[PDB]
Amino acid sequence: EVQVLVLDGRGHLLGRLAAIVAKQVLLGRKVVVVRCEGINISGNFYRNKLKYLAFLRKRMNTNPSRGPYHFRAPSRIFWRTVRGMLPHKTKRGQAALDRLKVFDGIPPPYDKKKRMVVPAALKVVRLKPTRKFAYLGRLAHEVGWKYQAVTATLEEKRKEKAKIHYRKKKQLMRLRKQAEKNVEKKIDKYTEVLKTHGLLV
Amino acid sequence: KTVFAEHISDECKRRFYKNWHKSKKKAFTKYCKKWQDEDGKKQLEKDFSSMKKYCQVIRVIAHTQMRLLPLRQKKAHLMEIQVNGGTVAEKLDWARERLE
Amino acid sequence: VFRRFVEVGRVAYVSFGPHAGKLVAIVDVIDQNRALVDGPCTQVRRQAMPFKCMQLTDFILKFPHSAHQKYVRQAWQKADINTKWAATRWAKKIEARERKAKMTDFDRFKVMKAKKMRNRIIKNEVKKLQKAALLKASP
Amino acid sequence: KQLASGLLLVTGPLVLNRVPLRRTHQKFVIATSTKIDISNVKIPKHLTDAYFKKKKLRKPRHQEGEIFDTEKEKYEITEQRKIDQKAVDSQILPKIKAIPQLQGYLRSVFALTNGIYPHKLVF
Amino acid sequence: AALRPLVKPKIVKKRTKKFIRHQSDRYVKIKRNWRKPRGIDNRVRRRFKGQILMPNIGYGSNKKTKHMLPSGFRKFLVHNVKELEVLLMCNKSYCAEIAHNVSSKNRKAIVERAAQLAIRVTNPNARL
Amino acid sequence: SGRLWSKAIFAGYKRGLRNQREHTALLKIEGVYARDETEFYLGKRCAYVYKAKNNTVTPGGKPNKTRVIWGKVTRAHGNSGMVRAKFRSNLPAKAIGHRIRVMLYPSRI
RNA sequence: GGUUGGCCUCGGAUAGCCGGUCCCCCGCCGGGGUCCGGUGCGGAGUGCCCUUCGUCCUGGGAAACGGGGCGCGGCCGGAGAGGCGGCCGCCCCCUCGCCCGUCACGCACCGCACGUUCGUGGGGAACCUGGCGCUAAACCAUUCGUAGACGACCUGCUUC
RNA sequence: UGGGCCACUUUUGGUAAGCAGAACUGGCGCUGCGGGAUGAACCGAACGCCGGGUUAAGGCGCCCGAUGCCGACGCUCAUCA
Ligand SMILES: [Mg+2]
Ligand SMILES: [Mg+2]
Ligand SMILES: [Mg+2]
Ligand SMILES: [Mg+2]
Ligand SMILES: [Mg+2]
Ligand SMILES: [Mg+2]
Ligand SMILES: [Mg+2]
Ligand SMILES: [Mg+2]
Ligand SMILES: [Mg+2]
Ligand SMILES: [Mg+2]
Ligand SMILES: [Mg+2]
Ligand SMILES: [Mg+2]
Ligand SMILES: [Mg+2]
Ligand SMILES: [Mg+2]
């Protein structure tokens, strides 16, 4: 596939989605992961927050300016998880890493696009229902992220625009159904041909 | 979006130049012409309404007046000052009426 | 919520495994994972099959638990499942998917021509429906 | 029919898809499951591989090539071939018009889109 | 055009790159000429992976095509016309080549003699 | 007037973890994700088509910048699509993650 | 140097979902409750939409309320990276294209690869060609001392 | 050559030691290769230059070849798993 694969990050497990994305990006296939604040992590929130705080403590003590860079936005947190699963210190890994674009919320080249979903990394199929999990958006917020509030208002405004679009899509589907009922005597011989070959039960 | 006033003072224009002596002081010369032609006002009026509709925090650009100071410097100092206390619409007209 | 259950006589459709695509009646249930199954009229002899392969249907046969083959069959033939199913919309949609896969290159070509013109008529009518719906001038 | 050298003798119904009486290799074709009963057809006897073998002209009495052979770049469709093609197609065209939209099917070309995959297609 | 050999088998070389001496790249005092590394801790001598290869007898060329020039022939160095005459009856597997010291006027006579003897010369135009 | 070849992709050479055998290459064919699905392609000719600077001769056409390294599918490599192929010369490492064509050439269908 | 059709988007739940409708309430569209369907999702991404051999005679059907003109002009929407999408008036043509038929033709290049797209691709100089536009700064040198190891930095230099 | 060292098991001194001293076999030294991420000695296997096939030990989320099996049955929630 030559087009860009756009994945909605909501409801996905951080390391299971990164596993899919890393291999997909190493075979070409420019990948876009949006809504990185909706990514889930298994286990209760507190033990996941402790895991990042321990990561925050990893720091070059002689010069922290050079040490590990603790990125705080969920998109940058996700990008680093994929980074830790590519051979990023070789030309192939860097070239693969540049094929991945990660976003918080859905910026408006992708809000008007259909978003894919990876079932093999979804929280609902990979986690038992009676298990605790953490949201990447809340984990990042309490670790230093500063744009959870504004992204929420922008995400909400995007959701009002999407409802208007889905309002119309149901409108033009209701019209097309009434149309198909309207023109049946002139379509019946054509519908049957499509019927006998599997399409249109 | 940034919108400037017509008739910007010379000491303010001095800040845009590293060498006033060798310059011909053309800064903002094609800009102020849009405050006077009829096409430009509708461009500036639309620029103000869009700032009123889409912006959250607005600031005014103000400069000090060197000519009233005992310093050798004639070059003014520029600074954005945040305008607080009101809706964006009503702090936009507040800054408009204080332009120039 | 929870319309269909695993009981004695419940007809289940087998999705994968050696008997994929077959119908089967749950004769008994063992150890929470397997179930004694029996398709006497669908060519599936009595055996144990896991619940993972099954997909329950809305048909239920009234016979005692762990009954013999002949009693499960007579219950299957009376109120015959082979005709209620297959002429059920789940099954005829399974049939549609089957004939779509076995569609040949020429059949694919004839489908494309009909589908090109099937749409052309619908697209035109929707354009007529939208314009004939647009004349609205009521305060 | 198949030729004595293993090459398949195929025709496009030249009127339909512009493929004349021409040999093709069994291994570089795809057998679609669509047939026409070409029983009761008279394929002329002189349609062998020697008939279809490529011809040549160069080079008569010329060794050092400085004046170039500015002819024969137009391979000539011999009047014979036009007659054999006319004979075969005239008794194969009506048999194609018999089954619906076979003429339209033959006018089209096979292709792969960004959907279907060859290992899944039934031919 | 040129004189064809008696037979032209496919020449198969088990290795085309030269065997360079260990650490010959790091120094100018160390020439490319192969030297077997007799060092107690040498990793090339121990034959570690990814190291410089050591030549051995397994790389030997086929008996049939050994010493064959890239065109079906085997070399023979000649210094005068008399040494040309010895190649008259091989003529199809061995080609003469003139030594570097042979003067311009003398090697002209060697080239003319080989032409009428159907002997292939690897350097037939070397003083003109 | 049509694509006429299935689009594979060059994933790497057949290798261990620390040893890489460049004489065979592993291909990921689109739409095939099981070993039993690879039987269709198990002999098809594959091509790595690329461009360069200098014009090269083109069979049946005027010289242009397009070049090709030919090959063919040898067998399946492991439980999920993943054909492995042999090329007339080992593919360059620059081609990893790039397009390989599977030509529907010699056909058994 | 890549590539070899597009998908222009609800929010989501998963011990539940989706669609449609009659009565209430929100300055003639939205929200509630009834009712009706579908649910191994068929209003289906295991999906949908385009579909290319081209023309000339020649009818039947779809349409006639139409299309295509980078043709013009205007309006509207989009700000999270809007770099985009949509709607009207004018002018050119023709019943052309879409399905099924009639009719014959085209290099039919004598079995053969890198064919077929994006694409009028990106980047760098250069010629010719018309129309509309503009005529600047930076650094050095010199001053300053709010600065300073040197660089750097803060300053001034024909007019009221 | 007459400095040896290590591992299974047996074994002496010592609280013990990557300590000191013995017995047997194997190894490293003198030895590269696959695995144990890394490693003189562990596991597999010992080596001329190559092509095809198949294995050992070990593995098959991604790094990283291979489970992208509709794998089977349980157990387990850890605010230092
Ligand atoms: Mg900070
Ligand atoms: Mg050599
Ligand atoms: Mg050297
Ligand atoms: Mg040593
Ligand atoms: Mg000399
Ligand atoms: Mg000694
Ligand atoms: Mg000891
Ligand atoms: Mg030894
Ligand atoms: Mg050893
Ligand atoms: Mg090892
Ligand atoms: Mg270890
Ligand atoms: Mg081998
Ligand atoms: Mg491993
Ligand atoms: Mg892998």
Curated annotation (Swiss-Prot), chain A:
InterPro entries hit by this protein: Ribosomal_uL13, Ribosomal_uL13_CS, Ribosomal_uL13_euk/arc, Ribosomal_uL13_sf
One cellular component (GO) term of this entry: nucleolus
Pfam families according to UniProt: Ribosomal_L13
CDD domains linked to this entry: Ribosomal_L13
Modified residues (Phosphoserine): S75
Effect of S75A: Loss of interferon-gamma induced phosphorylation
Protein family per UniProt: Belongs to the universal ribosomal protein uL13 family.
GO BP: cellular response to type II interferon; cytoplasmic translation; homeostatic process; lung morphogenesis; macrophage chemotaxis; negative regulation of formation of translation preinitiation complex; negative regulation of translation; positive regulation of natural killer cell proliferation
Compartments (UniProt record): Cytoplasm
Species name: Homo sapiens
Its job: Associated with ribosomes but is not required for canonical ribosome function and has extra-ribosomal functions. Component of the GAIT (gamma interferon-activated inhibitor of translation) complex which mediates interferon-gamma-induced transcript-selective translation inhibition in inflammation processes. Upon interferon-gamma activation and subsequent phosphorylation dissociates from the ribosome and assembles into the GAIT complex which binds to stem loop-containing GAIT elements in the 3'-UTR of diverse inflammatory mRNAs (such as ceruplasmin) and suppresses their translation.
Primary site of residence: cytoplasm
Keywords: Acetylation, Citrullination, Cytoplasm, Phosphoprotein, Ribonucleoprotein, Ribosomal protein, Translation regulation
Positions bearing N6-acetyllysine: K189
Keyword DNA-binding applies: no
Curated annotation (Swiss-Prot), chain C:
Protein keywords: Acetylation, Cytoplasm, Isopeptide bond, Phosphoprotein, Repeat, Ribonucleoprotein, Ribosomal protein, Ubl conjugation
Residues recorded with modification N6-succinyllysine: K84
CC terms in the record's Gene Ontology section: cytoplasm; cytosol; cytosolic large ribosomal subunit; cytosolic ribosome; extracellular exosome; membrane; postsynaptic density
Gene Ontology molecular functions: cadherin binding; RNA binding; structural constituent of ribosome
Ribonucleoprotein is among the record's keywords: yes
Residues modified to Phosphoserine: S138
Modified residues (N6-acetyllysine): K78, K84
BP GO terms, sorted: cytoplasmic translation; ribosomal large subunit biogenesis; rRNA processing; translation
Superkingdom per UniProt: Eukaryota
Entry's localization field: Cytoplasm
Transmembrane helix in keyword set: no
Cross-link (Glycyl lysine isopeptide (Lys-Gly) (interchain with G-Cter in SUMO2)), chain numbering: K123
Function: Component of the large ribosomal subunit. The ribosome is a large ribonucleoprotein complex responsible for the synthesis of proteins in the cell.
Assigned protein family: Belongs to the eukaryotic ribosomal protein eL14 family.
Subunit relationships: Component of the large ribosomal subunit.
Name the UniProt record assigns to this protein: Large ribosomal subunit protein eL14
Protein's organism: Homo sapiens (Human)
From Swiss-Prot, chain E:
Gene: RPL32
GO biological process: cytoplasmic translation; translation
Cross-link (Glycyl lysine isopeptide (Lys-Gly) (interchain with G-Cter in SUMO2)): K8
Subunit structure of this chain's protein: Component of the large ribosomal subunit.
Keywords in alphabetical order: Cytoplasm, Isopeptide bond, Phosphoprotein, Ribonucleoprotein, Ribosomal protein, Ubl conjugation
Residues recorded with modification N6-succinyllysine: K49
Claim: Magnesium is one of the keywords in the record: no
Highest taxon, organism lineage: Eukaryota
Protein name: Large ribosomal subunit protein eL32
Native source species: Homo sapiens
Higher taxonomy: Eukaryota, Metazoa, Chordata, Craniata, Vertebrata
Entry-linked SMART domains: Ribosomal_L32e
Family the UniProt entry places it in: Belongs to the eukaryotic ribosomal protein eL32 family.
One Pfam family in the UniProt entry: Ribosomal_L32e
GO cellular component, one term: cytosolic ribosome
UniProt cross-references to PANTHER family, sorted A to Z: 60S RIBOSOMAL PROTEIN L32 AND DNA-DIRECTED RNA POLYMERASE II, SUBUNIT N, LARGE RIBOSOMAL SUBUNIT PROTEIN EL32
Residues with the Phosphoserine modification: S61
Subcellular location: Cytoplasm
Record-linked InterPro entries: Ribosomal_eL32 (IPR001515), Ribosomal_eL32_CS (IPR018263), Ribosomal_eL32_sf (IPR036351)
Curated annotation (Swiss-Prot), chain F:
Modified sites of kind N6-succinyllysine: K62
Keyword Repeat listed: no
Main subcellular location: cytoplasm
Subunit structure: Component of the large ribosomal subunit.
Keywords, comma-separated and alphabetical: Acetylation, Cytoplasm, Diamond-Blackfan anemia, Disease variant, Ribonucleoprotein, Ribosomal protein, RNA-binding, tRNA-binding
Miscellaneous note of the record: Knockdown of RPL35A in hematopoietic cell lines results in decreased cell proliferation, increased apoptosis, decreased biogenesis of mature 60S ribosomal subunit, and abnormal processing of large ribosomal subunit rRNA.
Modified residues (N6-acetyllysine): K7, K62
Top-rank taxon, per record: Eukaryota
Molecular-function GO term, any one: RNA binding
UniProt subcellular location: Cytoplasm
Cited Gene3D superfamilies: translation elongation factor selb, chain A, domain 4 (2.40.10.190)
GO annotation, cellular component aspect: cytoplasm; cytosol; cytosolic large ribosomal subunit; cytosolic ribosome; extracellular exosome; membrane; synapse
Protein name from the UniProt record: Large ribosomal subunit protein eL33
Pfam families in the record: Ribosomal_L35Ae (PF01247)
Gene that specifies this protein: RPL35A
GO biological process, one term: cytoplasmic translation
Protein family: Belongs to the eukaryotic ribosomal protein eL33 family.
Function noted in UniProt: Component of the large ribosomal subunit. The ribosome is a large ribonucleoprotein complex responsible for the synthesis of proteins in the cell. Required for the proliferation and viability of hematopoietic cells.
